[PDB]
Structures are given as C-alpha cells and as structure tokens.
Amino acid sequence: LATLKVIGVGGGGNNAVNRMIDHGMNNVEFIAINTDGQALNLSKAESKIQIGEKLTRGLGAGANPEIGKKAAEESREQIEDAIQGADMVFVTAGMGGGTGTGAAPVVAKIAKEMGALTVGVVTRPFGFEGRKRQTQAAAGVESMKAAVDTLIVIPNDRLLDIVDKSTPMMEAFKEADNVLRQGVQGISDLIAVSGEVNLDFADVKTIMSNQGSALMGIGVSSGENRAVEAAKKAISSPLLETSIVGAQGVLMNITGGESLSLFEAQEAADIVQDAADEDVNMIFGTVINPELQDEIVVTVIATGFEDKPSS
Numbered sequence: 587l588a589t590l591k592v593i594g595v596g597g598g599g600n601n602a603v604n605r606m607i608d609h610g611m612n613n614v615e616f617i618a619i620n621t622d623g624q625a626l627n628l629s630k631a632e633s634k635i636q637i638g639e640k641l642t643r644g645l646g647a648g649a650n651p652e653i654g655k656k657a658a659e660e661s662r663e664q665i666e667d668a669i670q671g672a673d674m675v676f677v678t679a680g681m682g683g684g685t686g687t688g689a690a691p692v693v694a695k696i697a698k699e700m701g702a703l704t705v706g707v708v709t710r711p712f713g714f715e716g717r718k719r720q721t722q723a724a725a726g727v728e729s730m731k732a733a734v735d736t737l738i739v740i741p742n743d744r745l746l747d748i749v750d751k752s753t754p755m756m757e758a759f760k761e762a763d764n765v766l767r768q769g770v771q772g773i774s775d776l777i778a779v780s781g782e783v784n785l786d787f788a789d790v791k792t793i794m795s796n797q798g799s800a801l802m803g804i805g806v807s808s809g810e811n812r813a814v815e816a817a818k819k820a821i822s823s824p825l826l827e828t829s830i831v832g833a834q835g836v837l838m839n840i841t842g843g844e845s846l847s848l849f850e851a852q853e854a855a856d857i858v859q860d861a862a863d864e865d866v867n868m869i870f871g872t873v874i875n876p877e878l879q880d881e882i883v884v885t886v887i888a889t890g891f892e893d894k895p896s897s
C-alpha cells in the first residue's frame with residue numbers, strides 16, 4: 587500500500603505532529619524537522635532531523651526565513667534520506683516565523699522532486715502578530731505554492747471565529763489540526779479498503795497532482811437527511827482560506843452500511859457540485875461497511891480552483 591509521511595517543519599509544524607501522534611494515526615510515518623534542538627528533543631516523532639546546527643547553534647531561526655531556507659538547503663541529503671520511498675508526503679508548518687517559512691518550501695520541493703505526491707497544510711499568522719509576520723508568511727505561502735502539488739492554507743485569524751472568550755488556545759489549535767489529520771486519515775482509509783465503487787491512490791493522484799489550492803474534508807451523519815448533512819459538513823470551511831467554491835475536480839467517497847441508497851448518494855454529490863458552482867469532474871466512490879448501521883461518512887478532496895472558469 588502507498589507509503590504516507592507527515593512532516594512537521596518548525597515550531598507550529600512540530601506541534602501539529604506531536605498532537606497528531608497523540609490523537610492516534612495508523613500507517614503514517616512522522617518526521618520532525620527543526621532548527622530548534624530543544625523542541626526536537628521533545629518531539630514524539632520516530633524520525634527527527636535537526637537542520638542548520640552551524641547557522642543557529644541548535645537554536646531556532648529567530649523569525650528569519652533566510653536562515654530557515656539556508657538550514658534546509660544545508661541538510662538536503664538528510665531530508666532526502668528521511669523521505670526516500672514515500673508515495674505521498676504532507677508538509678505542515680506555521681508561516682511567518684523563520685524555520686517553517688524558509689524550510690517548509692525546501693522540504694516540499696525535495697519530496698516532489700523525488701516522486702511523492704506532495705501536499706502542504708500551513709497556517710498564516712494572527713493579525714495580532716503584526717504586519718511583518720503577515721508579510722513574511724505571505725512570501726512563505728507563495729514559495730509553498732511553487733513547491734507542492736496541492737496547498738491548504740488555514741489563516742489563524744479564523745480560529746477567532748470558533749472560540750468563545752474562554753476557549754483554551756490549545757483547544758483552538760486542535761481544531762486547526764483536524765484539517766490535516768482528517769485529510770490524511772481519509773486517504774489512508776481510501777487506500778486500505780476496497781470499495782463497491784472503488785477509488786484508490788491513482789484517483790488521489792489524478793485529483794491532487796500538479797494542482798494549486800485544495801480542500802480536504804469529511805462529514806459524518808445519521809438519520810433523516812444524513813447524506814445531505816454529511817456532504818455539507820465535508821465542504822464546510824470556517825477555518826479555510828480555500829472554500830469549495832470554484833472547485834473543478836472532486837474526489838468524493840461515501841461510506842455507509844447496507845442501507846446506503848442510490849438516491850442519497852446522488853443527493854450528496856449534488857450538494858457538492860451545487861456548492862462548487864462549476865463544471866465539476868467528480869471521481870465518485872462508494873464503500874459499504876456492514877458493521878455500520880445508520881451512519882454515513884462523506885469524504886471530499888477538491889481541486890482545480892485555478893483552472894479557467896467555465897461558461
């Protein structure tokens with residue numbers, strides 16, 4: 587089965603990796619990449635790469651993206667060794683600092699160069715962090731676009747839309763973490779199970795390879811209108827820079843029990859295509875899990891946003 591790897595670059599990326607490992611992920615290899623030796627020492631990842639030792643003396647990049655870049659370039663061989671054999675690589679980082687901003691694009695370009703389907707999931711800084719951080723991050727996002735197959739951007743300001751006055755910062759961070767984690771899990775599940783209408787890693791490549799922005803979502807629902815409700819949840823995007831609107835390619839997998847109806851499968855597909863408001867090329871799949879009773883799961887991967895709009 588296709589070899590999946592998730593690579594956290596810099597502080598935010600490392601944090602995401604640690605929290606994903608805590609949450610529980612089967613058949614995924616994690617790699618932690620940082621300049622900061624103290625943070626690496628605390629990483630839960632099975633594979634750790636300290637980059638730029640000579641430049642930083644084991645410290646972080648001090649918000650300087652040129653140091654993050656030079657560090658990654660300096661450690662290219664070690665990064666190549668850690669990635670070798672991967673079929674798909676997810677690179678996650680916080681844009682705005684030095685290590686994520688400068689090194690994540692280098693890491694992604696190595697992963698792609700060496701044949702892996704490469705997806706980035708990065709954050710933009712909070713407005714309260716100031717304009718310099720925002721400007722550095724914007725350059726990082728542009729660099730990431732050039733280095734990956736597909737990119738998902740999570741503006742940290744969106745977290746302010748899902749918290750009340752007391753929600754812990756760490757709880758908010760976990761909500762952002764769900765984007766990459768559930769995207770990885772949906773691909774892992776799609777590879778592992780044969781479906782009645784079967785989609786596999788080649789379908790994922792068709793949808794995600796050499797594209798631009800992406801949306802990856804999952805919805806789960808039971809009862810009346812379950813399919814419509816699951817599809818709406820899969821495309822809901824309160825934390826995303828890139829919503830479903832304008833998608834021209836969608837991989838949609840529906841998992842249900844024996845009761846999964848043709849009518850509700852069409853309903854789900856129609857929700858996604860109507861929200862995209864485009865001529866969508868839909869690669870549709872269906873998995874019947876007989877242990878499931880009234881539950882339905884809809885997973886969506888959407889791309890093609892940069893393609894010329896249709897008439």
Ligand SMILES: Nc1nc2c(ncn2[C@@H]2O[C@H](COP(=O)(O)OP(=O)(O)O)[C@@H](O)[C@H]2O)c(=O)[nH]1
Pocket residue numbers: 595596597598599601602646647648649679680681682683684685686687709710711712715719742759762
């Ligand atoms: N959502 C989220 N954002 C983070 C986290 N840690 C850092 N950030 C964001 O990431 C940006 C870069 O921080 P950091 O990754 O620690 O810097 P670096 O190590 O030099 O790359 C910060 O400016 C924040 O906006 C996290 O755990 N979650």
